[PDB]
Amino acid sequence: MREDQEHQGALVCLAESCLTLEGPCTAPPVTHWAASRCKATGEAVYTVPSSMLCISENDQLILSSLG
Amino acid sequence: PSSGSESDLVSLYEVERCQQLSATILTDHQYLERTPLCAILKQKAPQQYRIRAKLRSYKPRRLFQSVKLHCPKCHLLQEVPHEGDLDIIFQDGATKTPDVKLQNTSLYDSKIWTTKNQKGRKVAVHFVKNNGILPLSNECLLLIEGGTLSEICKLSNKFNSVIPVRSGHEDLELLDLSAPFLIQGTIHHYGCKQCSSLRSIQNLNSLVDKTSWIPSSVAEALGIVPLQYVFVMTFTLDDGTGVLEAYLMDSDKFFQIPASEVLMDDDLQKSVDMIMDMFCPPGIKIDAYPWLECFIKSYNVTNGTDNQICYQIFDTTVAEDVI
Amino acid sequence: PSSEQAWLEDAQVFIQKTLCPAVKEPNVQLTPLVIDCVKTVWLSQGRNQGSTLPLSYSFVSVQDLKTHQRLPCCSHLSWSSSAYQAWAQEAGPNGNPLPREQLLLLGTLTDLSADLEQECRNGSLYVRDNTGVLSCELIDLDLSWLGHLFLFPRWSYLPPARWNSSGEGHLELWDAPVPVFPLTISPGPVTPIPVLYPESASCLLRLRNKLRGVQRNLAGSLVRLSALVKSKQKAYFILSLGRSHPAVTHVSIIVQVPAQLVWHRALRPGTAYVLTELRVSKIRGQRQHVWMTSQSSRLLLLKPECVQELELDPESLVRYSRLLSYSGAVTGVLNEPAGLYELDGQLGLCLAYQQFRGLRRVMRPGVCLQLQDVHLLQSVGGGTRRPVLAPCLRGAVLLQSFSRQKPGAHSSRQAYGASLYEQLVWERQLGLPLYLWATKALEELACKLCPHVLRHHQFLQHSSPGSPSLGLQLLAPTLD
Amino acid sequence: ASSHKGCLQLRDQSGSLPCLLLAKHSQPLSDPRLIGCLVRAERFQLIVERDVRSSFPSWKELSMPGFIQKQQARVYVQFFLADALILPVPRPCL
Ligand SMILES: [Zn+2]
């Protein structure tokens, strides 16, 4: 069982060391774009209808037919 | 405005007599003859064209909005969830009670904890087994209920890949398809709620193997249709002969940067910022913008009953040395 | 097969393909020794406390590594993830750590390159197996190791830098390799070897006619070492042995045998050595001569009983630089291809006046350097405040420790142009302040003209008879 | 030579500057072949014409700031070709 328990304890060690066993939570690192999104939260976000972005499979068909 | 009319005049566009080199090369259809923009406008869609232009302007200016999720099954775009949204999901799992019959099985075994000080939060961990035996960490698919987004992220960094779940009365189930059906280090995989018909963890038995854990495979096993990552941008192309707005949608081609990882890796974000402020340097006049050769298709949207002609870029990439 | 049996069989197949010497039949006697070796080092930490064998790790060949890898990576065997992480954040601490991988590297370590225009020693080192040859960088090499088969337990692999077309990546060996076979300890000299000491040797280097009777050998502490000089064909270096350190009486020696260029890595100052089977060379313009090595020359570590000592102002801006010896660590790169680095965030280091062609593949943040007889030029001008340490051929660069950090991401504006600056220094023969200024001026020009008007690798190509290069032509009117 | 004005221009990746080349003292630039060459000049004049639409009442108010209602400059350069060095930009190559 030494090998088996060692393997399972490796997994358990990774888990528990990663888990916040006690105390308060902590802030992870944040990248440029993520922090900028957090700061800009509330701006009217940009988006586009997929209809405009080539939902026309008929046009796709005759396009791909072209040489 | 007098200076207005002057600056307007110096902001005009010279008709391709220039000495500069191209910034972008099209990978395919190079044989096509150049079609001036005006010639395109005077023709009805759909059609293929090969053009040379400069970006007079592009959107969105704040690039952190440019990334979108995409479902290929129904061709639907979807916004990326914020970390606050994921928190609003994971928060409902912190208070749940683990069930005895969901602990240890032929397919997965578990370990439990109660995290102190954190309002008495409950957490349970389950490890999936290969042929009934725990695989090595590099292949160890791990399942969580009660872990936070940061914790599950840091754990996914260590284990192969991890699946958020909750206590289903029959068997473990993804606590919400809004959350990632699979997080694999810096990669979060999501699914289309419309097209999906999800399945419980036991249905991992449908997999060809219990070692690769290919995201597509496990998504199919769990009955989830995975969403692609794509950039979506609008280029305001100008060629003096005319002005044309064309959309760019691509995954890991145009910028040669993985749209799946860009949101979580900072160097890629620096890279895309640099690219877009190298096509469109800040402040200086359109005289100095570099030429941009690209291949575009045209097609009729007809959402307004008819017409609504649009253009989309294809098969083009930034030149190697320009990056 | 069992997991362990499967692993053993896979390792045996790998050895049969990659490592069994083609000189002989695939002798099975090899596999038990390598298995014992890897098991030994795996257990030596006592941190495994489980599997007797690191089944996780997978063996790799040289060609396999070249074709499979295209990222920086570290392959520490016999360390826990905890120890690996702590070591990776040991010095930075916040620096980007080399990503860990679980590969086992074994092969033959030797000076012999694969090239054949000459013997092509050139002081290079390579790891060899059946699949190919790969160059490596090693600290304080014991020349005894050359030619033996080892299991390297701690190494970094760095892919070829993006700018480099040759694509010849290189390894970094962090610690002494574990030889697969038991130690082949061979007997040294029991007789006290007669050697001339530096004072008598100096007398003889003056009075070359008196080179008779006394044995043509030497010994002493390495007090001064030169960089490797590479002429049209003659690649050579010079060193100096002193009777003591710090002390006056010392004698210089020139080493020119191609097979012996590898010694340049073996030697290190302070330690005392024995040189043998020498002759006194004659060089144009050297009134006092120097001793030189023959093909029969042996390099040997000194042990006393093994030797017998044979004894017979803006008013006038000209300013002089101060020699000294320095030890420090590179904090960051100012201009990589020109060879301008920060030491400790305090001193500028300009290598361009040495050959500098090899160090560029090692030099990155966190490297530890010891510089001997570096010229210190403070107040160098051109707006550059930082005093610029600058080695010349008389000094030498000693790598103390490799870097833990992964190399910086390639930027097309940054890497290109080393040949042009090399030309500036070794053909136009500029001085240090003007070289600094030219570097900054070419930065400005590249910021004006490239990449849209003229790509960098065209703007900064070396001026040649076939075609000149704008970078030199736009500067020439001022340099003249 | 900018085809929206006919006037010559020195141009690079940062913008453009109007220029007034002379071939030599009392002889104008006469050769179309200079288009696109890389011009280097280290003995040149930078001119600045200032237009102002002031409303000062008298010599007294020339100490006051509020009356300079509009300011326009018009900066350009001028020099002889004999004082410049001219290099042709190479073609792209690989
Ligand atoms: Zn869908």
PDB file of C-alpha atoms and ligand atoms in Angstrom, chain B residues 71-76 192-196 225 227, ligand 1:
ATOM      1  CA  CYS B  71     -20.761  28.256 -31.334  1.00  0.00           C
ATOM      2  CA  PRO B  72     -20.140  26.438 -34.647  1.00  0.00           C
ATOM      3  CA  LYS B  73     -23.294  24.323 -34.322  1.00  0.00           C
ATOM      4  CA  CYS B  74     -25.695  27.283 -34.608  1.00  0.00           C
ATOM      5  CA  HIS B  75     -23.246  30.108 -35.487  1.00  0.00           C
ATOM      6  CA  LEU B  76     -24.008  32.226 -32.423  1.00  0.00           C
ATOM      7  CA  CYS B 192     -23.559  26.469 -25.843  1.00  0.00           C
ATOM      8  CA  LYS B 193     -26.607  26.169 -23.589  1.00  0.00           C
ATOM      9  CA  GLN B 194     -28.930  25.964 -26.603  1.00  0.00           C
ATOM     10  CA  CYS B 195     -27.196  23.085 -28.394  1.00  0.00           C
ATOM     11  CA  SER B 196     -26.019  21.141 -25.334  1.00  0.00           C
ATOM     12  CA  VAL B 225     -21.169  21.483 -27.396  1.00  0.00           C
ATOM     13  CA  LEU B 227     -17.605  27.096 -27.834  1.00  0.00           C
TER      14      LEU B 227
HETATM   15 ZN    ZN E   1     -25.153  26.659 -30.319  1.00  0.00          ZN
END
